[PDB]
Amino acid sequence: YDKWEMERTDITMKHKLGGGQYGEVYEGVWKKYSLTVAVKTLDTMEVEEFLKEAAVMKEIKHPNLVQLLGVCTREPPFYIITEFMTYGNLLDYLRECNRQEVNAVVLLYMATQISSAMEYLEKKNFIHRDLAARNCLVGENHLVKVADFGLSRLMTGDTYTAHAGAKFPIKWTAPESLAYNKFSIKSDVWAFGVLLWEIATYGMSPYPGIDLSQVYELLEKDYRMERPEGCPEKVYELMRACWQWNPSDRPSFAEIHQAFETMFQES
Ligand SMILES: *N1=[C][C]=C2[C]=C(O[C])C(C3=[C]C4=C([C]=[C]3)N=C([N]C(=O)[N][C][C]=O)S4)=[C]C2=[C]1
Numbered sequence: 001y002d003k004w005e006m007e008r009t010d011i012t013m014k015h016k017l018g019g020g021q022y023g024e025v026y027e028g029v030w031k032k033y034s035l036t037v038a039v040k041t042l043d044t045m046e047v048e049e050f051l052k053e054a055a056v057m058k059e060i061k062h063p064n065l066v067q068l069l070g071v072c073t074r075e076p077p078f079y080i081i082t083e084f085m086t087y088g089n090l091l092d093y094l095r096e097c098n099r100q101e102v103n104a105v106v107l108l109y110m111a112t113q114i115s116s117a118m119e120y121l122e123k124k125n126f127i128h129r130d131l132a133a134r135n136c137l138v139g140e141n142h143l144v145k146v147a148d149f150g151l152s153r154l155m156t157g158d159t160y161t162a163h164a165g166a167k168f169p170i171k172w173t174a175p176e177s178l179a180y181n182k183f184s185i186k187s188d189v190w191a192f193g194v195l196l197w198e199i200a201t202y203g204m205s206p207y208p209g210i211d212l213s214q215v216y217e218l219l220e221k222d223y224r225m226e227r228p229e230g231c232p233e234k235v236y237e238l239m240r241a242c243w244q245w246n247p248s249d250r251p252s253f254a255e256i257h258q259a260f261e262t263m264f265q266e267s
Pocket residue numbers: 017018022023025038039040066080082083084085086087088089134135136137147149
């Protein structure tokens with residue numbers, strides 16, 4: 001709390017990041033260290049929600065989770081200051097990358113990193129609820145960090161019920177969430193599967209061409225996305241395992257990370 005607090009004049013604001021895709025996030029400079037930082041500023045979302053986002057993040061410490069640096073929560077406008085990522089989101093990164101550099105073993109390394117962060121959150125009784133390539137960020141040397149700004153506290157055996165009339169990213173959303181607004185860590189496992197598919201396709205859109213209003217119906221009848229071009233069968237089986245209808249049948253992130261660790265060590 002107090003140790004995280006810093007004065008607003010320690011930061012110089014530059015231009016907005018991502019053209020508003022991340023919301024009110026600006027590139028900033030922490031003058032004292034001459035360090036480029038990311039500053040979330042607050043219309044927009046509610047104040048207490050904003051403040052809780054900051055409160056949760058200072059409990060979070062993992063090499064593959066975006067790190068909180070400080071906060072300005074004494075006088076408006078409120079600031080949340082996090083580390084700045086060199087390249088931006090994983091989706092645009094994969095679409096624009098050199099695939100000879102970002103090859104099969106790099107993809108595996110990226111999945112291992114993301115699954116490592118989710119294994120951590122799983123242990124710390126958190127859920128993400130928006131795991132996707134657009135919410136992963138990339139630093140140099142194929143470093144990947146999961147954005148952890150919308151984390152919810154949830155015990156491992158419990159269920160989060162989203163508010164009435166909530167809008168979901170349908171093509172990343174688990175069937176129990178689409179139908180009953182229920183979220184759990186197994187729901188993040190589903191989203192991870194789709195995130196894997198994004199990575200294996202270098203940023204293709206999920207269920208391409210398929211009408212959003214029929215996605216749930218397709219899932220009911222056990223339709224699943226095809227094995228991507230050049231995707232290892234073992235990796236695709238992990239994807240299919242993530243997309244099991246019964247959430248309790250889906251793998252934990254501990255098992256997912258272990259499987260990816262093995263593959264990354266054997267290539
Ligand atoms: N508050 C709430 C939500 C946030 C989401 C989010 O991204 C998912 C960020 C964020 C965005 C970016 C960061 C760091 C954190 N670094 C970037 N680098 C970049 O774009 N490089 C290319 C050009 O400079 S983008 C913050 C959020 C805060």
